[PDB]
Nucleic acid binder design. Structure first.
Ligand SMILES: Cn1c(Cn2ccc(C(F)(F)F)c(Oc3cc(Cl)cc(C#N)c3)c2=O)n[nH]c1=O
Lengths: 526, 411
DNA sequence: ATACCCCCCCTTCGGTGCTTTGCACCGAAGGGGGGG
């Protein structure tokens, strides 16, 4: 009852909605008349130009233009809670309020902006549905009701999502019942009609996809859809379901499933043997359900990372050995050319930022990589990168550096020169080594950089174990110097394989189309 | 009591709407006990859902501070209110401050909290505290008084600041004074025992009239590092090719740098590792090249109209550089920030302290912070930079993904 | 039933900026899970 309202306005420029209403419909009259008694929806005179659309179901009142015209509201919520971040609590209770919306008044000035004309005109004394800031308004009011109790005693832990009021304590059962009854009365004092205490839930619960037990937690059981023929839409649904399941079940691979999606809702496509085999494997993994555990601040987080191949990693955050708190996978590939170390540092950054978001602290990593390897990589890479803290763990596959491009010239190795060109307004490659070895060749759909990479590939092709190269373009230097492993361009993959086969390679750069050193001949033929 | 100066934005564009990044549990735990105290003393007040504006917040630990502090990222507010300070009031930049023997920096922002702020503008400076595992929404607070770290606050407070410091300027005309954000720079040509004496005297003077403030750097002792070419007796084809390429790169910076005899010297497809004779003509060319490189770039000039852009290149072994300029290929300043002390402990911390040094030097010399082009990935920088931050100012940075493989400021 | 918002996950566009003409890159959208 004593709930002070919140000012409401709109974006400047023009008043509220102006679309004609509709009295007649599928009766629907006595429903709203009842709220006139206690004033939830009151009667207003015929002087309201702010006409609103009308809707009733079995009242999701339409505001398709009002939401477009309402002033911007800041996001009250910033995500969804996760079970792993909940501390061990003995007693727990749920008190989901009744509809959460018909006990909170609406601002006095704003009532004129909305109307409900069913011959006559009714004003809303209460928050409607399909409203821009209704979750925010209720959430702020709901905190304004809660905070005296939390200030009175902070032992009781209270979570709150949308319209729900999760209470937890480490007290006995009867004391918890007394405290929750006191909370019920305190909430009622501000005019909330919560469901009866007999209707409160007792564990195991069912939350937003998660079933919670006195000492464990997991997701609600799911099944994998099966059909002889798959359209794209069902493939996307399966990918989403697998990604959702990947939060607690260790070792879930959804990538080479997802490559099938690269060929595209209702459209139907054939399948692949890899897809069927790995779907069967995933079904075998999901056959037996596993359990998580709950946070314990008297200990520390120790995450581990493993590599599954072709740019995919899995992590398993826990506190007690072989008792997972959470599990996940990282597979996204941004950019074009990365090795495994760059993706590993992206993975550790994502794991630590997620751990900060969830548990508010970072885990002491366990990485499958040698100390000296990371030391060399961070002392040699021109960018600045960091890893929080990590201990070596022996688990194959072991991420490491594949090939080392030499920083010094070497004797006993032939010095190749490379060059190519194309048409600015369909290119060619041609170069002269220190002895006249030329392998000029055209190619289609190429440009300067493509033919430079082609010339590098040719030089690697017609060289020995040790060879030095001089290039007229920095693009190839930028590509190869990063020690890349996988690439969109197959030529780059071939070049990487060639450098892996060889032992020692050294490079250099010269200005292009300048006739300096060996640039005269290599820029003459092509 | 004390009146307030109304603050108005530039019509046509919106206010700050930056999402607040997550924070460590200890940062939240300290910010709660700091913002509750700030609200008790009427400095800040809560607000409801109707406020569509939000700015971040994070609790740093000041240099050799047993307590914590607080910073609110007011970058967007300054981005929208630059014209307020560019028109309303502008303190002249002392040309002699660059040439002073030594200066001291004091945190004088406390008095910024004793001046009420405008009513209309008071809405815009709203900041959200995060929550652990997002169990409860952000407790969105509002600055009732002038905020620490906001660019326009010194513009309002400089009248009373001048009124306070006029006696000190009168009795001590030698001292030079420069205020930037919440920090004050006092410049003297005194010795350590006298510079410290005058700084403690100024602190006591501020104490005598109800202003409390809780290191030493030398503007004159900063020297630009000119690029030089390597010199030795036995040169190879690879080394001379590298020298010719570097002469090319540097011809962009220096108009008079030329390479034609060395380019004509290399005509055959020779091995890199062989030893090649170097003619006396190339000796004279190299001598002239080094003479050009030693001299500072001719025609270097500064324009306050444009913004300052600072690139940083990591040369390894605990060494970084920093190049500050406005117009491409004509650097206004270059430097070399080296330390092996923190190399074994951290790598991003080096970049943070380098950025702090660059912005402090730019504020001492030219008076405006540089726009940084950091050599780091966006998310790894945004995750950890606050853990190694101690300066109440926040510079603007943008990560150039392009690889600057040249690195000819230092081979 | 057909409209309404939050984190996560992917794939596929557009635009940026030369690294200037392909290319590497990143942000915004379009579906998926969870639902509210
Ligand atoms: C089952 N259970 C537990 C686990 N547990 C521990 C603390 C709390 C807290 F007090 F924080 F709300 C719980 O309340 C919640 C929180 C959330 Cl996100 C969803 C749901 C649902 N549906 C219930 C809680 O479920 N501990 N002991 C026991 O029996």
């Amino acid at each position: 009852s004593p709930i002070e309202t919140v000012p409401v306005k709109l974006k400047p420029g023009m008043d509220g909605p102006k679309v004609k209403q509709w009295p007649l419909t599928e009766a629907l009259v006595e429903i709203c008349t009842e709220m006139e008694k206690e004033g939830k929806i009151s009667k207003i005179g015929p002087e309201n130009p702010y006409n609103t659309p009308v809707f009733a179901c079995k009242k999701l009142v339409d505001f398709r233009e009002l939401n477009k015209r309402t002033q911007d509201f800041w996001e009250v919520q910033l995500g969804i809670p996760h079970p792993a971040g909940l501390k061990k609590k003995k007693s727990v209770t749920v008190l989901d309020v009744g509809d959460a919306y018909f006990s909170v008044p609406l601002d006095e000035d704003f009532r004129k902006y909305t109307a409900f004309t069913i011959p006559i005109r009714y004003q809303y004394n209460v928050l409607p549905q399909g409203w821009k800031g209704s979750p925010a308004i209720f959430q702020s009011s709901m905190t304004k009701i809660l905070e005296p109790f939390k200030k009175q005693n902070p032992d009781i832990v209270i979570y709150q999502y949308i319209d729900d009021l999760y209470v937890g304590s480490d007290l006995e059962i009867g004391q918890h019942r007394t405290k929750i009854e006191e909370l019920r009365q305190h909430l009622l004092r501000w005019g909330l009609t919560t469901p009866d205490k007999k209707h409160q839930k007792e564990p195991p619960f069912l939350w937003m996809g998660y079933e919670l037990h006195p000492d464990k937690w997991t997701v609600q059981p799911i099944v994998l859809p099966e059909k002889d023929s798959w359209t794209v839409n069902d493939i996307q649904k399966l990918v989403g379901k697998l990604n959702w399941a990947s939060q607690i079940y260790p070792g879930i691979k959804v990538r080479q499933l997802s490559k099938l999606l690269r060929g595209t809702l209702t459209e139907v496509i054939p399948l692949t043997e890899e897809a069927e085999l790995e779907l069967a494997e995933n079904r075998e993994i999901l056959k037996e359900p596993v359990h998580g555990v709950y946070y314990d601040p008297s200990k520390d987080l120790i995450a581990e990372i493993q590599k599954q191949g072709q740019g995919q990693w899995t992590y398993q955050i826990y506190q007690e050995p072989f008792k997972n708190l959470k599990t996940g996978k990282y597979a996204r590939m941004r950019g074009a050319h990365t090795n495994d170390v760059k993706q590993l540092t992206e993975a550790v950054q994502k794991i630590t930022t997620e751990s900060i978001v969830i548990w508010g602290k970072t885990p002491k990593f366990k990485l499958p990589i040698q100390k000296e390897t990371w030391e060399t990589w961070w002392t040699e890479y021109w960018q600045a990168t960091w890893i929080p803290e990590w201990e070596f763990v022996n688990t194959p596959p072991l991420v490491k550096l594949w090939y080392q491009l030499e920083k010094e010239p070497i004797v006993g190795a032939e010095t190749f020169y490379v060059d190519g060109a194309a048409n600015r307004e369909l290119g060619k490659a041609g170069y002269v080594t220190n002895k006249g070895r030329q392998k000029v060749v055209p190619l289609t759909n190429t440009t300067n950089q493509k033919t430079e990479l082609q010339a590098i590939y040719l030089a690697l092709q017609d060289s020995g174990l040790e060879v030095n190269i001089v290039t007229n373009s920095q693009y190839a230097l930028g590509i190869i110097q990063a020690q890349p492993d996988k690439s969109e361009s197959e030529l780059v993959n071939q070049i990487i394989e060639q450098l892996i086969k060889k032992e020692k390679v050294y490079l250099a750069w010269v200005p292009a189309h300048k006739g300096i050193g060996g640039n005269e001949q290599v820029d003459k033929l092509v | 009591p004390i009146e307030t100066v109304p603050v108005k934005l530039k019509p046509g564009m919106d206010g700050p709407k930056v999402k607040q990044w997550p924070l460590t549990e200890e940062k939240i735990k300290a910010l709660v006990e700091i913002c509750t105290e700030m609200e008790k003393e009427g400095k800040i007040s809560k607000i409801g859902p109707e406020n569509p504006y939000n700015t971040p917040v994070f609790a740093i630990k000041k240099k050799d501070s047993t307590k914590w502090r607080k910073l609110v990222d007011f970058r967007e507010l300054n981005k929208r209110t630059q014209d307020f300070w560019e028109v309303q009031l502008g303190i002249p930049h002392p040309a002699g401050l660059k040439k002073k023997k030594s200066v001291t920096v004091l945190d004088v922002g406390d008095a910024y909290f004793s001046v009420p702020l405008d009513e209309d503008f008071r809405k815009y400076t709203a900041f959200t505290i995060p929550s652990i595992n997002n169990k409860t929404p952000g407790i969105r607070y509002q600055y009732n008084v002038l905020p620490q770290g906001w660019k326009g606050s010194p513009a309002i407070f400089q009248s009373s600041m001048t009124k306070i410091l006029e006696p000190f300027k009168k009795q001590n005309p030698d001292i030079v004074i420069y205020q930037y954000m919440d920090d004050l720079y006092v410049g003297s040509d005194l010795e350590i025992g006298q510079h410290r004496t005058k700084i403690e005297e100024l602190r006591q003077h501020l104490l005598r009239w109800g202003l409390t403030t809780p290191y030493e750097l030398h503007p004159d002792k900063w020297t630009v590092q000119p690029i030089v070419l390597p010199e030795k007796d036995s040169w190879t084809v690879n080394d001379i090719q590298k020298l010719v390429g570097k002469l090319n790169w540097a011809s962009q910076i220096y108009p008079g740098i030329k390479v034609r005899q060395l380019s004509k010297l290399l005509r055959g497809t020779k091995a890199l590792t062989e030893v090649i004779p170097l003619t006396e003509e190339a000796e004279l060319e190299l001598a002239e090249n080094r003479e050009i490189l030693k001299e500072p770039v001719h025609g270097v000039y500064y324009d306050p109209s444009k913004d300052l852009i600072a690139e940083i290149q990591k040369q390894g072994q605990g060494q970084w550089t920093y190049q500050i300029y406005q117009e491409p290929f004509k650097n206004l300043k270059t430097g070399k920030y080296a330390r092996m002390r923190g190399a074994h402990t951290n790598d991003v911390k080096q970049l943070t302290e380098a950025v702090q040094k660059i912005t402090t030097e730019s504020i001492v010399i030219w008076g405006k912070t540089p726009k940084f082009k950091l050599p780091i990935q966006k998310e790894t920088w945004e995750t950890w930079w606050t853990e190694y931050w101690q300066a109440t100012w926040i510079p603007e940075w943008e990560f150039v993904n392009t690889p600057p493989l040249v690195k000819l400021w230092y081979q």
